[PDB]
């Protein structure tokens, strides 16, 4: 039983637009912040790589559907490129080529028995909106609503699973470094919090929009995808446990407390620690933006499920480190990783499968067991089809998730592997491989070929169980 998926549980795979599509300026698509980063700052990216072509999924979407069908995916999670649909960011111009493209992909999926799950925003802001300041400028919340309306109107008759945002914990960091994630602006501890504030407002507007203009007719569900690492106390002390709670609140709670609790608002520890630190440094005003009571009420409850992106764990101990000002310094935890944990091809990613079960329990207890859809989980290597490390990563994480479901009563409702295929891995270029399908980036045809992990995941999806040879 503990090795069998619930009957209604949805299994599949996931991608993101800039990581896979290419066709960066084709047929009316406008420029986004990742076009800008990779064109103007190739020094920020391994190999000076760009997403100009990537997997060429703009042209090769039918091949993506073919491999999803081979895999036996029930669901495909992909994102929509804002600037492909609204090239100027604002809703004055709708690019028919972009509408057609996503319709073509959606229709192909459905014709092959695969359900579309659509992320509206996976990091590719139109440059015209970044030029207003991007996420730190609250005007983007209404622009986001208008973008979502175009998506619901054009696609919502066939799409019933939506994510407003993917991982704003990461994308807010594009406002906390001059050399990092797009748009690579150095306002740590100030602009990243403003970005988070706008994203939360935007998410809430999009959910209310769905309620008001689309839900009765379309009958779908709207969530948000949040990334969170497990944070294990470095020792069993109460002080180290406090530091790990700080970590959860400063990383997951920053977004989930306003939306998924009955109280709403930011977590108290977030408000209080930033208030105190801001005062001690001489600011008249806290660096953390505030919600009014009316805004708290508007934002809380804006969810039909919680999307979780899970990859790894950290150790946390009591203390403070990092630069002043910064979210890490404000968070009041000293973070490390254990040298004993198996490694990947990504410095930040260690294999800690039991951390997945711990995190799912933390979420269950904090948010009153919301329906959780695992929107990303996966592993990097540098290449190869006999990807034993990735196979082990998937079988262990799936076993831990099944224990969370069956032993711990966590309401996990679906799981999409990150990623369907090797793709443009942001600042790492093509150097880190996360796919279950390999892609030859030197071959203009970009063939997709199954790794061992794709074969094992197909076996899992077909049998609806963990095969005996991978059981404890
Ligand atoms: O710049 S660094 O400080 O050294 C490392 C930045 N983090 C940001 C958070 N990512 C995890 C969640 O982010 C996911 O990660 C996947 C694998 O990286 C991506 O392909 C997905 O698009 C993304 O949603 C991990 C890398
Ligand atoms: Cl101890
Ligand atoms: Cl066997
Ligand atoms: Na339209």
From TrEMBL:
<dbReference type="Pfam" id="PF00232">
    <property type="entry name" value="Glyco_hydro_1"/>
</dbReference>
<comment type="subunit">
    <text>Homodimer.</text>
</comment>
<keyword id="KW-0326">Glycosidase</keyword>
<dbReference type="GO" id="GO:0008422">
    <property type="term" value="F:beta-glucosidase activity"/>
</dbReference>
<protein>
    <recommendedName>
        <fullName>beta-glucosidase</fullName>
        <ecNumber>3.2.1.21</ecNumber>
    </recommendedName>
</protein>
<dbReference type="InterPro" id="IPR017853">
    <property type="entry name" value="GH"/>
</dbReference>
<keyword id="KW-0732">Signal</keyword>
<dbReference type="InterPro" id="IPR001360">
    <property type="entry name" value="Glyco_hydro_1"/>
</dbReference>
<comment type="similarity">
    <text>Belongs to the glycosyl hydrolase 1 family.</text>
</comment>
<dbReference type="InterPro" id="IPR018120">
    <property type="entry name" value="Glyco_hydro_1_AS"/>
</dbReference>
<keyword id="KW-0378">Hydrolase</keyword>
<keyword id="KW-0325">Glycoprotein</keyword>
<dbReference type="GO" id="GO:0005975">
    <property type="term" value="P:carbohydrate metabolic process"/>
</dbReference>
<feature type="active site" description="Nucleophile">
    <location>
        <position position="376"/>
    </location>
</feature>
């Amino acid at each position: 039983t503990v090795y069998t998926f619930p009957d209604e549980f949805k299994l599949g795979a996931a991608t993101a637009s800039y990581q896979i599509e290419g066709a960066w300026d084709e047929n009316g698509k406008g420029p986004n912040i990742w076009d800008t980063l990779t064109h103007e700052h190739p020094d920020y990216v391994v190999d000076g790589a760009t997403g100009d072509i990537a997997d060429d999924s703009y042209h090769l979407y039918k091949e993506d559907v073919k491999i999803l069908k081979e895999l036996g995916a029930q669901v495909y999670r992909f994102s929509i490129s804002w600037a492909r649909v609204l090239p100027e960011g604002h809703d004055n111009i709708v690019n028919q080529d972009g509408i057609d493209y996503y319709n073509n992909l959606i229709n192909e999926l459905l014709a092959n028995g695969i359900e579309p799950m659509v992320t509206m925003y996976h990091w590719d802001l139109p440059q015209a909106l970044q030029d207003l300041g991007g996420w730190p400028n609250l005007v983007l919340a209404k622009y986001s609503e208008n973008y979502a309306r175009v998506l619901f109107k054009n696609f919502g008759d066939r799409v019933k699973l939506w994510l407003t945002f993917n991982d704003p914990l990461t994308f807010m960091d594009g406002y906390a470094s001059e050399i990092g994630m797009a748009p690579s602006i150095n306002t740590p501890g100030i602009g990243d919090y403003l970005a988070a504030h706008t994203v939360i407002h935007a998410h809430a507007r999009i959910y209310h929009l769905y309620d008001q203009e689309f839900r009765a007719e379309q009958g779908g569900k709207v969530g948000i995808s949040l990334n969170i690492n497990w944070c294990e106390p470095a020792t069993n002390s109460a002080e180290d446990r406090a530091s790990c709670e700080n970590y959860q609140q400063f990383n997951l709670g920053l977004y989930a407390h306003p939306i998924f609790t009955e109280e709403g608002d930011y977590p108290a520890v977030l408000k209080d620690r930033v208030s105190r630190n801001s005062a001690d440094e001489g600011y008249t005003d806290s660096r953390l933006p505030q919600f009014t009571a009316e805004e708290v009420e508007y934002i809380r409850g804006t969810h039909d499920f919680l999307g979780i992106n899970f990859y790894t764990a950290l150790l946390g101990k009591s203390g403070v480190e990092g630069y002043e000002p910064s979210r890490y310094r404000d968070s009041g935890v000293i973070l490390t990783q254990d040298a004993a944990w198996p490694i990947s091809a990504s410095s930040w990613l260690k294999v800690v499968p039991w951390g997945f079960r711990k995190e799912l329990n933390w979420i269950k207890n904090e948010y009153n067991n919301p329906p959780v859809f695992i929107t990303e989980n996966g592993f990097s290597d540098y290449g190869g089809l006999n990807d034993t490390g990735r196979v082990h990563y998937y079988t262990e994480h799936l076993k831990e998730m099944l224990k969370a479901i069956h032993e711990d009563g966590v309401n996990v409702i679906g799981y999409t592997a990150w990623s369907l295929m090797d793709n443009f891995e942001w600042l790492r270029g093509y150097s880190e491989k996360f796919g279950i399908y390999a892609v030859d980036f030197e071959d203009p045809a970009r063939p997709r070929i199954p790794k061992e992990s794709a074969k094992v995941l197909a076996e899992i999806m077909n049998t609806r169980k963990i095969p005996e040879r991978f059981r404890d």
